Structures are given as C-alpha cells and as structure tokens.
Amino acid sequence: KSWVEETCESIDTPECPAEFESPPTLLFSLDGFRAEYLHTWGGLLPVISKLKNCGTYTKNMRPMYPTKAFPNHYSIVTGLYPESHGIIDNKMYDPKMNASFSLKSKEKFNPLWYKGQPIWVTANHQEVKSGTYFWPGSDVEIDGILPDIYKVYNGSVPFEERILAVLEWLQLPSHERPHFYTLYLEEPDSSGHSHGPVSSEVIKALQKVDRLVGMLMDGLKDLGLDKCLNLILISDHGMEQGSCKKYVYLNKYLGDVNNVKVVYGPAARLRPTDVPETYYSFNYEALAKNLSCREPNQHFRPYLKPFLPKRLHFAKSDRIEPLTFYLDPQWQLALNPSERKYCGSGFHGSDNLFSNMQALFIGYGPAFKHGAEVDSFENIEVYNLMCDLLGLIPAPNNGSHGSLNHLLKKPIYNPSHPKEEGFLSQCPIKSTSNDLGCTCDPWIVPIKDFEDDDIYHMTVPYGRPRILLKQHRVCLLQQQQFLTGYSLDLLMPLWASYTFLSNDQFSRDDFSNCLYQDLRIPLSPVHKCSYYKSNSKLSYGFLTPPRLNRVSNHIYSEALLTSNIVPMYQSFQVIWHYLHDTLLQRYAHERNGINVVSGPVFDFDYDGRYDSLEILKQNSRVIRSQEILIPTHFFIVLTSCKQLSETPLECSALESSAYILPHRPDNIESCTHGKRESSWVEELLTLHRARVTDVELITGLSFYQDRQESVSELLRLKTHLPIFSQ
Ligand SMILES: *[C@@H]1O[C@H](CO)[C@@H](O[C@@H]2O[C@H](CO)[C@@H](O[C@H]3O[C@H](CO)[C@@H](O)[C@H](O)[C@@H]3O)[C@H](O)[C@H]2NC(C)=O)[C@H](O)[C@H]1NC(C)=O
Numbered sequence: 001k002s003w004v005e006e007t008c009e010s011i012d013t014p015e016c017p018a019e020f021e022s023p024p025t026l027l028f029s030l031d032g033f034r035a036e037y038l039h040t041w042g043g044l045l046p047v048i049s050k051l052k053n054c055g056t057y058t059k060n061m062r063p064m065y066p067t068k069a070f071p072n073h074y075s076i077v078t079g080l081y082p083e084s085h086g087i088i089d090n091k092m093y094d095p096k097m098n099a100s101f102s103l104k105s106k107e108k109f110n111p112l113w114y115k116g117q118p119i120w121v122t123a124n125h126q127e128v129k130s131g132t133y134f135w136p137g138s139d140v141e142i143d144g145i146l147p148d149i150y151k152v153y154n155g156s157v158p159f160e161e162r163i164l165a166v167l168e169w170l171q172l173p174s175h176e177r178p179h180f181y182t183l184y185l186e187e188p189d190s191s192g193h194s195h196g197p198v199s200s201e202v203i204k205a206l207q208k209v210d211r212l213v214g215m216l217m218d219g220l221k222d223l224g225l226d227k228c229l230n231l232i233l234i235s236d237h238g239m240e241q242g243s244c245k246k247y248v249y250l251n252k253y254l255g256d257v258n259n260v261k262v263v264y265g266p267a268a269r270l271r272p273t274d275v276p277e278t279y280y281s282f283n284y285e286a287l288a289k290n291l292s293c294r295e296p297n298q299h300f301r302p303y304l305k306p307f308l309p310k311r312l313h314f315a316k317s318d319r320i321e322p323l324t325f326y327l328d329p330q331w332q333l334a335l336n337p338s339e340r341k342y343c344g345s346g347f348h349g350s351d352n353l354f355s356n357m358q359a360l361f362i363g364y365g366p367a368f369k370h371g372a373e374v375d376s377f378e379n380i381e382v383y384n385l386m387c388d389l390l391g392l393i394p395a396p397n398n399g400s401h402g403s404l405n406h407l408l409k410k411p412i413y414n415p416s417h418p419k420e421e422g423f424l425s426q427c428p429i430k431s432t433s434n435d436l437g438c439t440c441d442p443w444i445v446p447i448k449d450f451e452d453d454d455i456y457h458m459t460v461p462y463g464r465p466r467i468l469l470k471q472h473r474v475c476l477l478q479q480q481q482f483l484t485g486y487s488l489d490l491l492m493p494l495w496a497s498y499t500f501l502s503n504d505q506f507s508r509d510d511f512s513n514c515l516y517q518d519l520r521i522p523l524s525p526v527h528k529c530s531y532y533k534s535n536s537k538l539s540y541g542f543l544t545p546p547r548l549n550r551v552s553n554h555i556y557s558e559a560l561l562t563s564n565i566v567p568m569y570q571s572f573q574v575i576w577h578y579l580h581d582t583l584l585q586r587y588a589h590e591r592n593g594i595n596v597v598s599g600p601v602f603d604f605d606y607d608g609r610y611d612s613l614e615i616l617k618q619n620s621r622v623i624r625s626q627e628i629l630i631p632t633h634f635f636i637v638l639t640s641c642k643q644l645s646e647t648p649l650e651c652s653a654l655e656s657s658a659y660i661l662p663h664r665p666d667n668i669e670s671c672t673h674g675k676r677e678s679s680w681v682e683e684l685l686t687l688h689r690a691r692v693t694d695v696e697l698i699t700g701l702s703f704y705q706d707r708q709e710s711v712s713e714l715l716r717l718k719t720h721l722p723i724f725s726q
C-alpha cells in the first residue's frame with residue numbers, strides 16, 4: 001500500500017537502513033502556499049493532512065518582509081532578515097555595484113548579491129553534503145561553495161522529474177550521498193497569480209502538489225526511508241487577490257514624471273532614474289511629504305526607510321531604496337498604469353503580519369513531535385532548527401536558537417539567558433543641590449528631605465531587565481512605586497519598571513514645568529526645567545507616569561525626579577500622554593493589571609540594534625547651546641497573566657505585548673486631520689507593535705530572566721507577534 005494509507009504511528013527512534021547512520025533532512029517548498037489553503041481545503045489534500053496530523057504543524061508560519069519568493073526562500077536557509085542576507089526582493093538595484101538584480105537575468109548568478117551563510121554552505125564547512133533540486137542561491141557559488149549536487153534553476157523541468165532525481169540521490173553510497181536536500185515547486189504560486197487565490201484553478205493546483213508530496217513519501221517508503229527522514233514542508237509566503245480598483249498610481253499626485261523609478265506592488269520602493277549619480281542626493285523627503293495624507297483613508301503611506309515599523313527589519317541594506325511605501329491589505333502601488341503588470345491578478349509582497357501572507361510549515365519525521373500544533377513562528381527560526389537536525393553549529397543569524405525546541409521530541413540545543421555585560425554600581429546621594437528653574441504649582445508635594453524586597457518585587461515581578469550593553473555604566477534607582485535603570489554614561493534612564501493594577505487611580509492635577517533634582521545622579525544642564533522652557537525644538541517626557549499614585553491621592557512626586565525624564569518632542573507627547581492617560585488604564589482593566597517597562601531607544605544607523613558610543617556621539621545635536629541625544633524611538637513592554645484571575649504579581653504564565661514607537665517631531669505619519677485621537681494613537685501603536693526580542697535587540701536589555709519557565713519557553717514568549725486577521 002501507499003504511505004498516505006498507512007495508519008499514523010509514533011517514530012520514537014529513527015528506523016533507518018544500515019547504510020544510514022542518521023536521518024537526512026529534506027526542505028520541500030510549495031511556492032505561494034498560503035496557510036489558509038490548508039485551513040479551508042484540508043479535506044481535499046489527504047497527503048498533506050496526514051503529514052500535519054501525524055507531525056508538527058503551525059496554523060501560520062510568519063514570513064519575512066517583503067513577502068516575495070527570493071527574500072523568503074533565502075531567509076529560510078540563512079536564518080537572516082533580507083536586509084542582512086542581501087536579497088531584499090526579486091528585483092533590486094545596488095548603487096555601489098551600479099547593477100540590477102532580476103530572476104531572468106545573468107545577475108541572478110552573481111555571487112555579490114548573496115550574503116550570509118546558507119545551510120548548504122554551513123553543512124559543507126562541517127563535512128556534511130548537500131543536494132539541492134532548485135532553491136534561490138543554490139545554483140550560485142556562495143563563499144566559493146556550491147551544493148554537492150545542484151541544479152541550475154529551470155522552471156520547465158516537470159515536477160515528477162525533480163522528485164525522482166532526489167530519490168536517486170538518496171540511493172548514492174555514503175561517501176557521495178547528501179545529508180541535506182531541497183525540493184521546490186512553482187505551484188500553487190502560479191495558479192494563485194493567474195486565477196486568484198480563491199479559484200477552482202488553485203484547488204486543482206493544491207490537489208496536484210498534494211499528489212506529488214505523496215509520490216515523494218511513497219518513494220521514501222519504497223526505499224525504507226519513510227521513518228528515517230526529517231521532512232520540512234514549507235512555503236515562502238501567502239497570496240492575496242488584487243484589484244484594478246485597489247491600485248495607487250503616483251502620477252495622480254506628481255503628474256506624468258519620468259525622473260523616478262518605482263518598484264511596483266504592495267511593498268513599493270522609489271529611486272531616481274539617474275543612478276548612481278543622484279542615488280543619495282535625490283530629495284526623497286520632499287517626495288515623501290508630497291505623497292503624505294493626500295486622500296481620506298489613504299490606502300498607501302510613504303516611509304523613509306528608517307521610519308518603517310522596526311518589526312519589519314527592512315532598512316539596513318543599501319539595496320533598500322531611501323523611500324518605501326506601506327500598503328493596506330489587497331492594495332498595490334505603481335508610478336503609473338504603464339509601470340506595472342496586470343492589476344487584477346493574485347499577488348503577494350504585503351506586510352508579513354497580514355493573515356493572507358502567512359505561510360505553510362509542517363515538520364514530519366523521527367525528530368518532530370506527532371500530532372503537535374504550535375503557535376506561529378517566523379521563518380528565520382528554521383535555519384537553527386535545520387542545523388540541529390543535521391548536527392551543525394549555526395552561523396550567526398537572527399533566529400533565537402532554542403525557541404523551536406517545543407517542536408522536537410528530543411531538543412538538541414539547550415539555550416541560556418544572555419549574560420549581563422553592563423557595569424552596575426550604586427549611585428550615592430550627593431548633598432549639592434542646584435536651581436533647576438522650575439515653577440512647581442502649589443498642589444505639588446515637594447520632597448523636603450531626600451535622604452526592600454517587597455517593593456522591589458512589586459516593581460520588577462519577573463526580575464529586573466538585564467543590561468546587555470557591553471561595559472555600559474548603570475545604577476539602579478529604587479522608588480516606592482517604580483525602579484529605574486539609570487545610565488551614568490548618557491545621564492538619562494534606560495528603563496523604568498512599574499506595576500499598574502486594575503483598581504489603581506490616576507491623579508487629575510497638573511504638573512507642568514515641575515521637576516525635583518535626583519541627588520543620586522550627576523546633574524546635567526539638560527536635566528533642568530529652564531533648558532526646555534519655551535524650547536520649540538524639544539521638550540521632556542516621563543517614563544513612569546506621575547499621575548499614577550497607588551497609595552496616596554496626589555501627584556506622585558517621586559516620578560518628578562530628574563532621573564525619570566527623557567528628551568521628547570511636543571508632537572510625540574500627544575501619543576505618549578494619550579498612551580499613559582487613557583490607554584494604559586483600559587489595558588489594566590482588560591488584563592487585570594499590567595506591568596510596564598518603558599525607555600528610550602537609540603538606533604541612528606537603523607540596524608535594529610543598539611548604537612555604540614561612537615555612533616551616539618556622531619548623532620548628538622546642539623540645542624540651546626547644549627549637546628543632547630534625542631531618542632529615535634521609545635519602547636514599552638506590557639506584561640500580565642494568561643489567566644485573568646491573576647494579577648501581574650502572581651502570574652502562572654505571561655501575556656506580553658511590546659511596541660517600538662517612532663519618535664518623530666510631527667505626526668504626519670498618522671494623518672491626524674479629522675480623526676479621533678482615540679483611533680489614530682491606538683492605530684499607530686498597533687502598527688508599531690514588536691516582538692519582545694525586537695526590543696531586546698535595539699535596547700541591549702534582556703527581560704524576564706528571573707521567571708521559572710525554561711529559557712526556551714521564554715524565547716517563545718519573547719519572539720511572538722500577533723497577526724492582523726483580515
Ligand atoms: C541579524 O543577524 C546578523 C548576523 O549576526 C546581524 O548582522 C551582523 O551585524 C554585525 C554588526 O552590524 C556585523 O558585524 C561587524 O560589522 C562591521 C564589519 O562589517 C564591523 O565594523 C562591526 O564592528 C562588526 O564587527 C556582521 O557583519 C553582521 N553579519 C551579517 C551576516 O550581516 C544583524 O545585526 C542581525 N539583525 C538584528 C536586527 O539583530
């Protein structure tokens with residue numbers, strides 16, 4: 001009988017022919033197989049359903065942005081964001097090479113496009129052979145290496161021939177046989193484009209690839225390998241239905257210009273035509289502002305690339321144009337109707353948290369659990385996983401090694417929390433006080449005389465954030481209601497942590513132009529009220545909100561300490577004040593309290609990681625005759641319990657939400673004219689949600705280290721991001 005007809009049985013030990021010391025791994029891509037195809041038509045796909053039911057499955061594998069074939073396939077086999085592995089789209093221009101990349105051109109085989117270390121190169125360096133029957137990058141010499149058996153891409157090769165060849169490769173003698181294999185099919189991507197994702201044609205394509213996977217499995221069974229092979233069935237992205245009525249043309253606002261080139265689609269990019277001469281001198285900001293807030297409920301938004309949501313990690317490469325566009329679901333953008341393909345086809349490329357962009361993942365074999373359904377994870381985590389299946393040490397990458405251990409019968413790698421590399425000190429009281437220039441109102445209660453586990457636990461119930469910032473000088477400042485990690489190198493707080501219960505009340509009093517000098521920290525001129533007084537360029541904001549006073553009735557005066565302020569634009573205060581005066585109270589009511597950590601972010605070189613000291617010094621600004629460092633973003637992490645009966649101080653299990661809010665000196669991003677503040681501030685927050693791990697990378701902080709969950713369980717928590725359901 002066939003493999004699909006056999007009953008599902010646990011493979012607790014690999015059942016291998018004597019000529020196999022261990023099971024191979026096969027990575028099998030079904031291009032453009034959106035996660036929902038299996039949600040809805042699983043009854044029509046018996047083979048893929050058995051792999052899912054007898055294996056390890058997630059309803060949604062999150063792809064990378066932009067959700068295109070080449071960036072995502074290459075992310076899968078490198079563990080890297082496209083901005084790091086260099087393949088940021090199927091078509092690219094590189095201003096330093098002055099070259100264009102495309103899939104149907106000679107440049108596809110130019111090794112200079114492909115960065116990082118794909119898994120077959122990792123394997124080569126560690127004496128493991130590879131056999132690839134198509135995979136982006138696998139027919140290109142990368143690090144002077146090619147797969148041991150590889151095929152130049154040719155989409156005309158019949159699907160059956162591809163599967164048959166891998167089955168012959170598996171019969172080679174040990175000294176020639178690969179241990180890692182790839183297979184790739186162009187369906188159901190092709191039918192999804194030509195006829196739309198919801199069509200009888202896509203269904204026929206799904207049935208066709210399901211039959212083909214069964215041909216593979218039956219071949220493995222014939223070879224005695226169907227219980228000696230770790231199968232990863234995967235896709236690169238999902239599929240959306242495009243419309244000629246949902247297509248933006250920039251010539252509507254710019255006129256019929258030809259001095260710019262637009263990469264059309266849902267993740268459009270813009271550069272001048274006169275390159276490389278004007279690639280950097282072109283006035284991108286003027287163009288972006290001419291395209292901002294032009295329509296009510298505008299379905300596209302221009303972004304200079306450092307200002308895109310950090311969760312997309314789409315800016316560091318010089319192949320990413322300085323101007324990009326963010327598109328609503330189902331919408332696309334081109335310069336004009338002549339600079340695009342057909343406007344009514346299936347398409348992809350959109351935000352990688354859109355539901356219809358989500359991808360397929362099934363793991364089947366000795367190493368994978370049987371009948372396990374796990375929460376969503378990003379495809380950059382798969383490289384580490386394949387390294388564990390193959391016995392390989394991973395190259396440095398963006399996956400969190402160990403975060404997928406719950407997919408495995410017997411985890412290979414036991415992860416550890418990162419060490420604290422900061423220099424921690426106690427900050428003593430200095431008895432010298434200076435005039436800050438403040439004009440505190442009469443109802444503000446002064447701190448007349450300046451000169452603890454329970455208080456400590458209340459403020460940091462999961463352990464204090466750890467300082468990963470190498471050799472950075474930090475002292476902890478304890479208050480009754482919050483804890484501060486204070487930077488002695490920057491003279492501003494790196495984080496503040498406090499807990500906010502459902503019944504806690506906020507104060508109504510004003511506290512304008514009022515601060516109290518923290519005698520435990522060195523006094524800076526940019527600590528004083530007089531620095532920010534009538535300062536049109538810059539104001540200051542608080543990390544812990546002074547209106548929150550759990551025990552007393554007035555403004556919480558300890559939150560007015562100079563150790564609790566950060567430089568803050570007036571425009572961003574609209575967001576920050578609404579967040580802390582309105583949203584936080586509702587979230588505490590919805591979540592039975594929330595614990596909060598917030599702080600500044602400095603990522604001036606837009607690489608998603610904290611800046612070195614030399615980078616900070618280069619980006620200092622003189623404002624009112626003083627050097628000042630203005631954060632690029634502000635982060636906030638909200639934690640509460642899975643069970644609503646528990647307060648954030650007694651959680652059996654954690655519920656985490658994180659955000660990395662851009663710190664812009666206007667609110668043009670939100671097109672605020674005619675909108676309720678309730679709507680647009682919360683909409684901005686949702687768009688700029690992030691993984692906890694994203695916050696960790698960009699601040700050099702590590703969270704939750706005193707929790708009793710295993711490190712791998714905490715990595716799952718910290719790598720999660722909610723999908724926007726359509
Ligand atoms: C995703 O993982 C990537 C791999 O670890 C990581 O990229 C690495 O980033 C570092 C720092 O930018 C680079 O290291 C060196 O870079 C230059 C020389 O090119 C030096 O001046 C630096 O001091 C440093 O020694 C690595 O070259 C780079 N590796 C790769 C493959 O790109 C990304 O930073 C990670 N992304 C995020 C958001 O965490």
Ligand SMILES: Nc1ncnc2c1ncn2[C@@H]1O[C@H](COP(=O)(O)O)[C@@H](O)[C@H]1O
Nearest residue numbers: 068069070090103135136153155186189
């Ligand atoms: N290794 C490859 N080299 C070149 N083109 C490829 C390769 N793999 C897939 N393709 C093509 O990429 C296109 C699909 O891209 P996408 O629509 O972004 O999913 C189709 O034209 C495929 O034939």
Ligand SMILES: *[C@@H]1O[C@H](CO)[C@@H](O)[C@H](O)[C@H]1NC(C)=O
Nearest residue numbers: 097098099100274275276277
């Ligand atoms: C860039 O390359 C193109 C070839 O595609 C060539 O026409 C142009 O002269 C080059 N520009 C420079 C500055 O070398």
Ligand SMILES: *[C@@H]1O[C@H](CO)[C@@H](O)[C@H](O)[C@H]1NC(C)=O
Nearest residue numbers: 152153154155156157158161
């Ligand atoms: C692509 O594959 C088909 C196999 O059916 C073959 O006819 C064609 O010649 C191949 N193209 C190249 C360039 O090898």
Ligand SMILES: *[C@@H]1O[C@H](CO)[C@@H](O)[C@H](O)[C@H]1NC(C)=O
Nearest residue numbers: 283285286287288289290291
């Ligand atoms: C629109 O573009 C022009 C450049 O042609 C620029 O001078 C102008 O400042 C832009 N408008 C806005 C509102 O930024």
Ligand SMILES: [Ca+2]
Nearest residue numbers: 603609610611
């Ligand atoms: Ca940085």
Ligand SMILES: [Cl-]
Nearest residue numbers: 086317318319
């Ligand atoms: Cl690059």
Ligand SMILES: [Cl-]
Nearest residue numbers: 091092093263
């Ligand atoms: Cl391009």
Ligand SMILES: [Cl-]
Nearest residue numbers: 295298299300
């Ligand atoms: Cl629009």
Ligand SMILES: [Cl-]
Nearest residue numbers: 346347348349
């Ligand atoms: Cl597309």
Ligand SMILES: [Cl-]
Nearest residue numbers: 014023366367
């Ligand atoms: Cl195994």
Ligand SMILES: [Cl-]
Nearest residue numbers: 706707708709
């Ligand atoms: Cl715990």
Ligand SMILES: [Zn+2]
Nearest residue numbers: 031032069236
């Ligand atoms: Zn694809």
Ligand SMILES: [Zn+2]
Nearest residue numbers: 032189193348
């Ligand atoms: Zn496609």
